UniProtKB/Swiss-Prot annotation, chain A:
Residues 150-209, 210-271 form the Sushi domain. The gene is C6. This is Complement component C6. It comes from Homo sapiens (Human). Residues 73-120 form the TSP type-1 domain. The chain holds residues 493 to 763 of 934 of the full protein. It is linked to Complement component 6 deficiency: A rare defect of the complement classical pathway associated with susceptibility to severe recurrent infections, predominantly by Neisseria gonorrhoeae or Neisseria meningitidis. Disulfide bonds join C7-C131, C29-C78, C31-C47, C34-C49, C51-C60, C85-C119, C97-C109, C152-C194, C180-C207, C212-C254, C240-C269. Residues 197-271 are annotated as: CCP 2. Component of the membrane attack complex (MAC), composed of complement C5b, C6, C7, C8A, C8B, C8G and multiple copies of the pore-forming subunit C9. All cysteine residues are assumed to be cross-linked to one another. Individual modules containing an even number of conserved cysteine residues are supposed to have disulfide linkages only within the same module.
Curated annotation (Swiss-Prot), chain C:
This is Complement C5b. Disulfide bonds join C118-C176. Glycans are attached at N132. Component of the membrane attack complex (MAC), a multiprotein complex activated by the complement cascade, which inserts into a target cell membrane and forms a pore, leading to target cell membrane rupture and cell lysis. Complement C5b is generated following cleavage by C5 convertase and initiates formation of the MAC complex: C5b binds sequentially C6, C7, C8 and multiple copies of the pore-forming subunit C9. Membrane attack complex (MAC) assembly is inhibited by CD59, thereby protecting self-cells from damage during complement activation. MAC assembly is also inhibited by clusterin (CLU) chaperones that inhibit polymerization of C9. It is found in: Secreted; Target cell membrane. Complement C5b is composed of complement C5b and complement C5 beta chains that are associated via disulfide bonds. Component of the membrane attack complex (MAC), composed of complement C5b, C6, C7, C8A, C8B, C8G and multiple copies of the pore-forming subunit C9. Interacts with the tick complement inhibitors OmCI, RaCI1 and CirpT1. Interacts with cobra venom factor (CVF).
From Swiss-Prot, chain D:
Changing T41P: Confirmed at protein level. It comes from Homo sapiens. Residues 23-82, 83-144 form the Sushi domain. This is Complement component C7. C-, N- and O-glycosylated. O-glycosylated with core 1 or possibly core 8 glycans. It comes from the Eukaryota.
Amino acid sequence: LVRNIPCAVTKRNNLRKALQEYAAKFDPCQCAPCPNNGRPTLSGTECLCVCQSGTYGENCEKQSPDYKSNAVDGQWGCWSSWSTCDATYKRSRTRECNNPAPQRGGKRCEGEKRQEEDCTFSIMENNGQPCINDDEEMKEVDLPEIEADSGCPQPVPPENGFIRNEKQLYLVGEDVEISCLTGFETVGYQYFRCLPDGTWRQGDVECQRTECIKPVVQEVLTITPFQRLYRIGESIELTCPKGFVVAGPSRYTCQGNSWTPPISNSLTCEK
Amino acid sequence: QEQTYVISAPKIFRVGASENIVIQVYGYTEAFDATISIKSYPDKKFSYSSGHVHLSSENKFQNSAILTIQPKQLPGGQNPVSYVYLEVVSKHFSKSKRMPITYDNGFLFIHTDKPVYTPDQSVKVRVYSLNDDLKPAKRETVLTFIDPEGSEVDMVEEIDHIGIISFPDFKIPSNPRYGMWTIKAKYKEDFSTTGTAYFEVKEYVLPHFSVSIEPEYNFIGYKNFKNFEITIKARYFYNKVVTEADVYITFGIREDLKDDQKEMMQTAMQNTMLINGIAQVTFDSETAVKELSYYSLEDLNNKYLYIAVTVIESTGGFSEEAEIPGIKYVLSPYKLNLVATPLFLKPGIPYPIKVQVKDSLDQLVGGVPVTLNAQTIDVNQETSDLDPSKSVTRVDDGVASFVLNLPSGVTVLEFNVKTDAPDLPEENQAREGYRAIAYSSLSQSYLYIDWTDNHKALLVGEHLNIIVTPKSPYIDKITHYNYLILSKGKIIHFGTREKFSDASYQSINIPVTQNMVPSSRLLVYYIVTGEQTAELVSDSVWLNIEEKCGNQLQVHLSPDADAYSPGQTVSLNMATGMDSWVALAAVDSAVYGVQRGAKKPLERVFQFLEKSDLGCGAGGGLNNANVFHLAGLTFLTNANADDSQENDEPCKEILYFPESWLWEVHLVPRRKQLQFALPDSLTTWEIQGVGISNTGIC
Amino acid sequence: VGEILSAVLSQEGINILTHLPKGSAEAELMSVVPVFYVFHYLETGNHWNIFHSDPLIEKQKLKKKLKEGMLSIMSYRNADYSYSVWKGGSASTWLTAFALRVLGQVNKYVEQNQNSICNSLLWLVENYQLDNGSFKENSQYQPIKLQGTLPVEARENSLYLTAFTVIGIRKAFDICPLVKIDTALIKADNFLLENTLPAQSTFTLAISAYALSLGDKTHPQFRSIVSALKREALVKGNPPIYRFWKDNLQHKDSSVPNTGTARMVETTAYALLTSLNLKDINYVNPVIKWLSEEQRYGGGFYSTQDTINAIEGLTEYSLLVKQLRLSMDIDVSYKHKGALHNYKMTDKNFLGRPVEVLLNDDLIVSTGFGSGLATVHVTTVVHKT
Amino acid sequence: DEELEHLRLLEPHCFPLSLVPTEFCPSPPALKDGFVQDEGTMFPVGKNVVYTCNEGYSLIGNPVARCGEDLRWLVGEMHCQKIACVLPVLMDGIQSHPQKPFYTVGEKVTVSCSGGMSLEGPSAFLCGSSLKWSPEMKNARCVQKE
Amino acid sequence: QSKVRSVLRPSQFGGQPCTAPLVAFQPCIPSKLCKIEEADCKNKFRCDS
């Protein structure tokens, strides 16, 4: 029920922990068994017996003429302590169900004798619990800031460029450094100066092409991949070395403009 | 609840300041000690300061502790300490309250030898550096020049030995960006005060003559729209009129005081001859605009008349350009505001109201007629009205003063003030209205300061004489009332004022002291504990004090004339009330001519010292806690009050040919004479001395 | 560097030093593997310059336990330099790449016979590389959920395994750069770059992002995958105070550490590691703030993977923060003449006064190893006809 | 016995009070050309005191001392620097006429060079800070010729 | 700050009750500040409660 309050998740997990401990401390398992298979119950620090119908007196000590049954029902003993983590890092604990032992046809204990928990270990330094709520997730879809500081938004880099030091908002006079993707190299002034007006002072920089990346292909291969990057000038063989027949040209080479072949298509050989 | 206490403290502790904390206890008759301490928060573990104070009948159970949070004792590091515990302990009580602390001790004034520099000049700069007590801070200062790009350019730290920090000259970088450079000064270490100044780095020649454009007033309405007289005057900086010149006037319809398409009015571009240095002109908006543009009326132009003026000497090679950036075309020219008006009633005291009238592009309009009408609400909403009083604003102050005789039944007053502008309807003569609320005493146990609207500034060393009347059901029990005098954050004076046998009470007779000179705030309070319940009762008033310098440094040249002559050897005499440092700067008056209205560097420095006043408004308050809070105090009491409910928005109520030389700092041991040759410029040298001593800046 | 958001393991990392029994069923491996990571973390910082309290200062004994660990893991190496969950078990490529990762990470601190690394690498390449589906796993008959994750099974299981193996190889190929291992990295990186972008699962997206971040940090496909990941991110606050990644709603059940929280922590730590490799501190910071609040993922860690990856990420982040600390005496000198200026750049004095460079010389600017990051600008002003 | 201290610490007004301090430091240590600007006897444990220099001096370092629980004054490094300039920097033996060990801020030093020799330097300069002349007397030459 | 103890056995069958208090509390001065937040439940009407 700890569901719609400030810090609801924190207090909920605290109260789970709490209820564990509290059970452990005040479970009626630690009472002496009630007579006439009454149920012990532990209100605070006194055990009270709840009597079966046909048993009466303050602690069920005496029984009506019809309560001939002498069967002793096997109420649970207290859980043993958690065992040391096993070969699968599970701890387990067991309660014999001996308190009293079922006798003369008395019922066996209903709950499972044994419980198992994974050993799970807290390694971070503890500041104390944060206040955490069920509302505390939002995506990209969060609202923009007012940005009244008017510090510049992240600029659009040149094509084949990327922003080295991405930030959501740049203070006035921050350098944002453009850099070029693998095929490309910054020639010029790669830096934009965020002006107090929020204009960028677009730097005199362009990413020339120096390299060509190993091309995408329509096939599992139809290629020999000598390199990840092939210099401007070098060449490549799209090839189907056996059985399959070429359905496209073979030799291709890096011009700095672009790949001469089609990007969308390859030899489409039969493999 | 007979035994009660008030400990009164500045609303915020300044780090490194000495905070005078005053304790009053009521109903005790045995003497006892209390200790007042400042302890680290929340742990109370470190006692930053502690003061032991004896409360006894000759004290009259009133005493104070001088507590100081030394800056290096706070832990510092990544997090500043935002809070501290003020604690009191005695035989009879203990209480502790979380007090805010501020790392903001003292004042940095950046003095730049000129407002304007060409490139290749070095900007000589020095910082005057004052403690929260207005004493030489002796703190090293980090001084940061920001190019109008906003890029950090330079940082220089200089030891403060004197309260004057003569930084090295900052050579303008060999390719500056023109326009408004910024200088930021910060104390290097703990205190995080800031100073800021601006200088414009610009390609300029010193103008030869001060062309002055002096419109009759800064707005155009139905009166003026047909006819708007505007006066040109030009004087040389040696102050002799430009005996003849050709004046060129050009006009534009400027939509905003912004870089714009000015839509220049060739219909109105005009020539006149500067007869003996003056040329009266008038612009007719009708013929100008209708003849050139669609706009038939200022109903279409709630905008600005741009005007630019070229004066050419007509018999000489000099020419100077002057501008007004824009004169507001307006349907409704004026707005009211209150000045020094508490908006709090003192039932049975004449309620002074003061409205200033401001125009658009505000200046004090001086002579506008004003009428005030109000509704008076008595207890149980028993509503009534007052006849609409009229007053003309004071010509040299803009203030229409009013006084309303209020019956002692008034619970709230709400009053409206409107411009009886003869040339307008009310639909354009703007109008305003305000709520004024009574003190809301719970017991009806009121206290009033009978301050007779003495907004005229008080004179240092004169005796104050403020009548105070604790009108209360239990005046039988109110033996005495307490007063506190506040100046900046500090409780500078505190005391007690007996009930005479007649049940008159002593006036506040204390002399106004030199530590009060910017301003002061008087707060007056008593606890009366009638029946079994205490009420803290309090009032405060704003005290306007003369800006009398403590050292009163005065500077004059020994010879005197209409004019000295180029290169004339002259003696500068500096005479002072006390030993003082004095910093001298001569600049050519022309340099301000580079600009329109270039303010002298240390204009209104007392109006900057005033910003350490923690209170706001002219005094009064909604409630005892509100009275203390608006006075800039806070308190510990068991008398059924606390001001933790009193949080509010920030409060904005209003109440050789050198260009510069003589850039020198001297010890003037009460008198000193300089000798120097006046440079060859045929100009008025504005020579500014700034004194620094153990009594602050003059 | 800005805000150094500082987060650390507790001295309760004695829990990791003194870990759960070194038993059968790979419990030994779970015991010793984290010890390498914790040793690395302690190496990467003041922890063996100073402990204020509860010292883990006996780094000699810690190194002994470390090398006894490396022994115990090398025990798991089969005949032909595969690893197996058991001395006689089915050769597992997953386990082998895991071992290789470990050994590469630790070879910076304990020298170990690189020939075994070469042999196990070329085994993993030559026997189990296949096109599009690199490093396809040989049946181990079961996911050992205590050591592996539980991947997504229907699809991108192969993208998961390729990512894992590429990570391992990138951690170990540096100590045996045999050419065909580079060819295999080209193959696997290309397959990841092509297959990953329409990611089904944030977990896989994350891990493969990481793996590619070890590789071509600047490939356009990589940057696309990154730009995706960065949008799968979930946050709190108008400026994010916390940032993390979750998928399949494996978060509703975070009250106790479990496979769901384990997976969430895994995918977050991969995202974090990625970012770090991008050196994106502003991004990283709220992820370190999330990762350091145990409650947000159920308290402790669950399984090995989450734990190791979290320790790794805190290590890296520490490292990064150090590397960014500005301390850089920058020489500027003319080519044919004397020195011109010496900017003693420090975080106290990060600002270089504009220096006039009016002489006609070719102009050199240089610095030592120094520390941190600076940018030097020369403006040339000239009059053109 | 948990009552004996803890509630007396938390609510000291509720028990027989003992407000006058019992442990005192000695006098603050002396300062060269300065003094503790304070009541010279009242030194309870934990009291702060602050030093200041005599006229003509500036207190370098930390002015503040604290009476420790050891009854020793914890005090930082501090020194009274004189306000006056150090000597002009005589790199070329320049004949500074008004020679002094120290020169008041704003005091004008006048300087020349040996006859037949001629200062490449200003003949006069004013002290501005205790370690800084205006102009900056870092350097001036003498050997030049008229 | 709280303090706690445990029943080593409960009273029952009319035995002597656990007359002493089972949990104790003492005033203390915190070393740290609170980080709890207002509900601030967006659009939903915040009762005075």
